């Protein structure tokens, strides 16, 4: 059983522009661990698989969080630290391209369809249960958990928004954009580290380091 009610409880339970973005990212990594523990059956996975899943999806998981958190913001991002980053500030920092991609492809799309927190949690759980993660001791088990997530999500969409039959497919079709945006954001993270100009904290540094 993969009840969306508990997945919602997990989301509700965890509730220089570049430097401020890295600070918020490092701060949310600690919170991300607590969130994953609240997703049903995640803590029951082998510890090494839990590590693999988080190291593989931490970035997309955080990006999906601050994007949905910013649906009410006008041309800006609301960082977990409480700071509002406007697209002008991001453009003046040299990261305007990827920042714009987040607004057009994620925040705005979430705002237009009024993606609720239950659907966001289900999507974050879907990316969390990535059976393609390399090194998983049992990828089939992780895929079975993913299948139960989007199985409960579809039923929730067809019951909550019965007049929007395509809402379920629309939700899943934002994951490709989430995947590419995460890769690009990660490249920026490596350039920030490589250039050595930006402070990278311990937990965020650990994610930048190889397996």
């Amino acid at each position: 059983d993969m009840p969306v009610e508990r997945i919602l409880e997990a989301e509700l339970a965890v509730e220089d522009p570049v430097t401020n973005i890295c600070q918020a990212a490092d701060k949310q990594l600690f919170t991300l661990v607590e969130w994953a523990k609240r997703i049903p059956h995640f803590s029951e996975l082998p510890l090494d698989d839990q590590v693999i899943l988080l190291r593989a999806g931490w970035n997309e998981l955080l990006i999906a969080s601050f994007s949905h958190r910013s649906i009410a913001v006008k041309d800006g991002i609301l960082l977990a630290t409480g700071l509002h980053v406007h697209r002008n500030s991001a453009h003046s920092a040299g990261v305007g391209a990827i920042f714009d991609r987040v607004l057009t492809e994620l925040v705005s799309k979430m705002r237009d369809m009024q993606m609720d927190k239950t659907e966001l949690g289900c999507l974050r759980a879907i990316v969390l249960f990535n059976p393609d993660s390399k090194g998983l001791s049992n990828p089939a088990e992780v895929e079975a958990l993913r299948e139960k997530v989007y199985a409960s999500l579809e039923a929730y969409c067809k019951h909550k928004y019965p007049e929007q039959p395509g809402r379920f497919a629309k939700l899943l079709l934002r994951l490709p954009a989430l995947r590419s945006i995460g890769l690009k954001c990660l490249e920026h993270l490596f350039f920030f580290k490589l250039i050595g100009d930006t402070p990278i904290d311990t937990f965020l540094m650990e994610m930048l380091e190889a397996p």
Partner: peptide
């Protein structure tokens, strides 16, 4: 490392 310590408790 830090992830392991946080996944324990």
């Amino acid at each position: 490392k830090i992830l392991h310590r946080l996944l324990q408790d």
